[PDB]
């Protein structure tokens, strides 16, 4: 049946002209595509998995562009906020995100990433408690996470380290995930509480007392006051070697820096995207803090960098870094949605029309998403690209014999007439 | 001097005021004592310590991260906020290892101890170091660390001071039990 597919897309549009808000069109087709990702998943000729992922891959677009055009678009401003010195940190935090959009559209991405994150299945066997073999063997003197790097490494047993390694491993997995939450639990759980302490330093501090303005999500303090502090401390925990290289990369990552070379080359484009928006995002709050006074000389006890990258500088490089995976075409529209130049990328492949032939995703998606945008912003692509478009598709409902489902499409032009 | 939202805030922000040139008074009593100190170490776990009886956190997690105590050096870093998350993280730490825990360092425990908010209060006390330092000092380490949020700064000190008798003789004793004293100061 599969050959059913536009129908589904079609089904959409129907249902949306139908009812005389938009953004529900987008969010089906999110769902439609994910739908079709395990049909050709679930069994399937392993010629179907290549474009099972390429319906993933799909899916994630639709979802991305919804994240941010609800954002961008549903934009009704609302009422500034209005800080003191005394206040917190992370009241200005949470000021800048207000405020900047420009950034607020990092995080949004960020967020899409972390959702899209894999992660492996939780460790089983997990030991009773930390560091147990070294304990057993004798020769651990003190049971405290530095006590390996007071002296010798030789001092933990193989087993332990191997152990300390799936815990990590998990954990970074975790934290690139978002799973935040799921990581403190692992932590406590697994006897790991240190780690977890550690972990809870992500929050910047605020107080509801002082910080009336958030009296409403917190009844009590809390995160931590010497935040710059608890950064570089970090940092510098990361760099220091007889660590494991995931534990080093948890480290890295919550200082917004770039995780050592063992971790980092089995990054993805989406990874590595990630880490690096995440380095961007770290260093313009520490910024935005030291422009206003929020920090405090004593704890600039290290230099971390200080430049902050452009998200088209990032993509540049992570594109670089990653080419097979950046020039996938729907990756290309991934981009091009993240840096706006979307309308940009639609005229463009509608020039390609004048190598999109060959992979058939594409001219539907350019299509569909260019008669999203012209709903959701009346003007967006140009009258003639939106022609030129829907004429090619349709001519492609002929060749699959869907004839039926046509007029649909028509209601944009009055050229239609012409059918 | 700054205008403030509301007058609850007020009252907040003049209890910081107070609570910080409070503390500072205090390292500026305790400062020789402790540096003396600082100079007989032969340990540099022992001397982090001390660096957080003078309310140096910043000095302390230097000589951490110098000395090789990464983890320590960022779990320094929260002594002044008062995350009670951490608080009680700390605090079991110390259970588990108060409960097996075939060793730990003696001085690590006591900066433990000072994350958990209760330094004398406790299962892992830090009282018999009555008998190591001026009375002051070890007030500093409750007023400093100890639960500032929660408490006022009366009740603060007076919970400290119900865990320590004063010699009856010390004058600068006298005013922190008459401060603390506040419902029945006559």
């Given at each position: 049946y599969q050959t059913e597919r536009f129908t589904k897309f079609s089904d959409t549009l129907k249902e949306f002209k139908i009812e005389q808000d938009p953004f529900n069109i987008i969010r089906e087709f999110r769902s439609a595509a994910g739908q079709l990702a395990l049909d050709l998943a679930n069994s399937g000729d392993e010629s179907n998995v290549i474009s099972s992922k390429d319906w993933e891959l799909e899916a994630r677009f639709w979802h991305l562009?919804?994240?941010?055009?609800?954002?961008?678009?549903?934009?009704?401003?609302?009422?500034?906020?209005?800080?003191?010195?005394?206040?917190?940190?992370?009241?200005?935090?949470?000021?800048?995100?207000?405020?900047?959009?420009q950034l607020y559209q990092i995080w949004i991405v960020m967020v899409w990433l972390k959702e899209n994150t894999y992660v492996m299945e939780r460790p089983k066997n997990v030991p009773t408690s930390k560091w147990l073999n070294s304990i057993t063997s004798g020769g651990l003197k003190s049971c405290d996470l530095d006590f390996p790097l007071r002296e010798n490494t030789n001092v933990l047993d193989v087993k332990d380290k191997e152990e300390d390694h799936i815990f990590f491993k998990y954990i970074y997995?975790?934290?690139?995930?978002?799973?935040?939450?799921?990581?403190?639990?692992?932590?406590?759980?697994?006897?790991?509480?240190?780690?977890?302490?550690?972990?809870?330093?992500?929050?910047?501090?605020?107080?509801?007392?002082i910080d009336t303005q958030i009296a409403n999500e917190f009844n009590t303090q809390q995160g931590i006051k010497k935040h710059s502090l608890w950064r570089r401390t970090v940092y510098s925990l990361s760099q220091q070697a007889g660590?494991?290289?995931?534990?080093?990369?948890?480290?890295?990552?919550?200082?917004?820096?770039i995780p050592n070379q063992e971790v980092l080359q089995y990054s993805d484009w989406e990874s590595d995207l990630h880490i690096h928006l995440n380095q961007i995002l770290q260093t313009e709050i520490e910024n935005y803090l030291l422009e206003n006074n929020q920090v405090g000389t004593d704890e600039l006890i290290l230099p971390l960098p200080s430049h902050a990258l452009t998200v088209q500088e990032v993509l540049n490089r992570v594109a670089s870094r990653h080419p097979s995976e950046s020039e996938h075409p729907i990756r290309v529209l991934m981009a091009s949605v993240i840096l706006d130049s979307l309308p940009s990328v639609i005229h463009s492949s509608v020039e390609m029309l004048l190598d999109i032939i060959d992979k058939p995703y594409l001219l539907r998606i350019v299509t569909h998403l260019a008669i999203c945008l012209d709903i959701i912003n009346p003007g967006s692509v140009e009258e003639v690209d939106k022609s030129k478009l829907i004429t090619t598709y349709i001519s492609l409902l002929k060749l699959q014999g869907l004839y039926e489902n046509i007029p649909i499409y028509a209601t944009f032009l009055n050229e239609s007439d012409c059918l | 001097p700054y205008k403030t939202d509301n007058d609850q805030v007020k009252m907040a922000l003049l209890k910081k005021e107070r609570h910080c040139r409070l503390t500072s008074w205090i390292v500026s009593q305790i400062g020789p004592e402790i540096e003396?100190?600082?100079?007989?170490?032969?340990?540099?776990?022992?001397?982090?310590?001390?660096?957080?009886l003078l309310n140096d956190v910043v000095r302390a997690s230097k000589l951490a991260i110098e000395s090789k105590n990464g983890h320590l050096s960022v779990l320094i870093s929260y002594l002044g906020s008062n995350d009670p998350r951490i608080?009680?993280?700390?605090?079991?730490?110390?259970?588990?290892?108060?409960?097996?825990?075939?060793?730990?360092?003696?001085?690590?425990?006591?900066i433990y101890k000072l994350l958990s908010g209760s330094p004398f209060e406790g299962l892992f006390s830090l009282k018999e170091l009555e008998s190591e330092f001026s009375w002051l000092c070890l007030l500093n380490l409750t007023l400093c660390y100890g639960q500032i949020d929660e408490y006022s700064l009366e009740s603060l000190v007076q919970s400290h001071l119900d865990k320590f008798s004063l010699p009856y003789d010390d004058p600068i004793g006298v005013i922190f039990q008459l401060y603390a004293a506040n419902e029945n100061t006559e």
């Open positions: 562009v919804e994240l941010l055009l609800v954002f961008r678009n549903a934009d009704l401003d609302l009422d500034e906020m209005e800080l003191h010195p005394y206040n917190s940190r992370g009241l200005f935090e949470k000021k800048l995100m207000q405020d900047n959009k997995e975790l934290i690139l995930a978002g799973a935040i939450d799921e990581a403190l639990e692992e932590a406590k759980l697994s006897d790991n509480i240190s780690i977890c302490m550690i972990l809870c330093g992500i929050q910047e501090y605020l107080n509801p007392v660590l494991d290289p995931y534990e080093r990369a948890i480290y890295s990552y919550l200082s917004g820096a | 003396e100190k600082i100079r007989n170490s032969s340990n540099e776990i022992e001397q982090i310590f001390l660096y957080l608080r009680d993280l700390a605090e079991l730490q110390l259970q588990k290892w108060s409960t097996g825990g075939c060793s730990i360092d003696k001085n690590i425990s006591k």
